[PDB]
Amino acid sequence: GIGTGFPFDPHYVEVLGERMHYVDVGPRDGTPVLFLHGNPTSSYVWRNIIPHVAPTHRCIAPDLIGMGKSDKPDLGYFFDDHVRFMDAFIEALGLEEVVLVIHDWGSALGFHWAKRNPERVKGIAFMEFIRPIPTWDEWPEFARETFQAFRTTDVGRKLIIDQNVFIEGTLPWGVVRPLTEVEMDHYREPFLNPVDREPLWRFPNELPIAGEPANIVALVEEYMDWLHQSPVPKLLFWGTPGVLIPPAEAARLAKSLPNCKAVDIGPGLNLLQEDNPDLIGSEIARWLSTLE
Ligand SMILES: [Cl-]
């Protein structure tokens, strides 16, 4: 049975006038490992992978601004907002060199930070990450009508903000195996008040789909161009059928990206961490040992 508890002691750092929550476990020496979550999760999504890495490495998993146990100021919560906060989070913790373990929107932050700081990244493990979606035909059929609704200010805000559809609908429909009530309540916890659900709506409105928004497509195309050139060791977890990364796209990127190893986790949609945390955690620890 996949674990449901969150036993990590809370840590907080002040940043741009707000406090951000982060997990900090493992031995201090070595290269720290930085876990970046996405929408609509938090560091809770890493709770069963970190125990495979914490024996030998320091594990840092922050809650994005406006999410988890972090502060929730009245922001627009655009992707630029998360960039400015994650930039100053990494600097506030004195993280000189890091290994990235990123997912969903945490991967957009991780890849964009790596492009701007390539000398400070010693490895990138990633899964179901932000890539350009050329047309809506490359988006999964069963989720197309829902995400097109999300990307409007009338229907999309009614579903995500008023009815909490991204937590009540999108989250369980992004995991193959059934979630428990305790696991749902952990994801419901940061967004009990509808006024705090702004990040849950802006994030899908930022997804680079069909060239829109053009500023996010351009940004993702740049760090995807840097990925193809960089020699940084890469670990690519993928699931079947997946959501953002279909198996065929993972097969192409495993061979086209330099020093990229691909791992099949079995059945999976978007939250691969909830479908096979033991394989993901153990494969990260093994892969870290082959980098020294
Ligand atoms: Cl999203």
Author numbering: 3 to 294
Provide the authors' own sentences about this structure as they appear in the paper.
Self-labeling protein tags such as HaloTag are powerful tools that can label fusion proteins with synthetic fluorophores for use in fluorescence microscopy. Here we introduce HaloTag variants with either increased or decreased brightness and fluorescence lifetime compared with HaloTag7 when labeled with rhodamines. To engineer the binding site, ten amino acids on helices 6–8 in close proximity to TMR were chosen for randomization by site-saturation mutagenesis. The changes in spectroscopic properties result from single or double point mutations in the direct vicinity of the bound fluorophore.
The brightest variant, the double mutant HaloTag9 (HaloTag7-Q165H-P174R, ΔI = 19.9 ± 0.5%), as well as the dimmer variants HaloTag10 (HaloTag7-Q165W, ΔI = −52.9 ± 1.2%) and HaloTag11 (HaloTag7-M175W, ΔI = −44.8 ± 0.8%) were chosen for characterization with a panel of 46 different fluorophores and analysis of their photophysical properties. HaloTag10 and HaloTag11 decreased the fluorescence intensity of almost all tested fluorophores compared with HaloTag7. The decreases were more pronounced for HaloTag10 than for HaloTag11 but in both cases caused by changes in quantum yield. For HaloTag10 and HaloTag11, the proximity of TMR to the introduced tryptophans suggests that photoinduced electron transfer (PET) quenching of the fluorophore is responsible for the decreased quantum yields. The decreased quantum yields and fluorescence lifetimes of HaloTag10 and HaloTag11 presumably result from PET quenching through the newly introduced tryptophans. HaloTag10 and HaloTag11 decreased the brightness of all fluorophores relative to HaloTag7, HaloTag10 having the biggest effect. Photostability measurements showed that the higher the fluorescence lifetime, the more photobleaching occurred, making HaloTag9 the least and HaloTag10 and HaloTag11 the most photostable tags. We therefore recommend the use of HaloTag9 and HaloTag11 for multiplexing of two species and HaloTag9, HaloTag10 and HaloTag11 for multiplexing of three species.
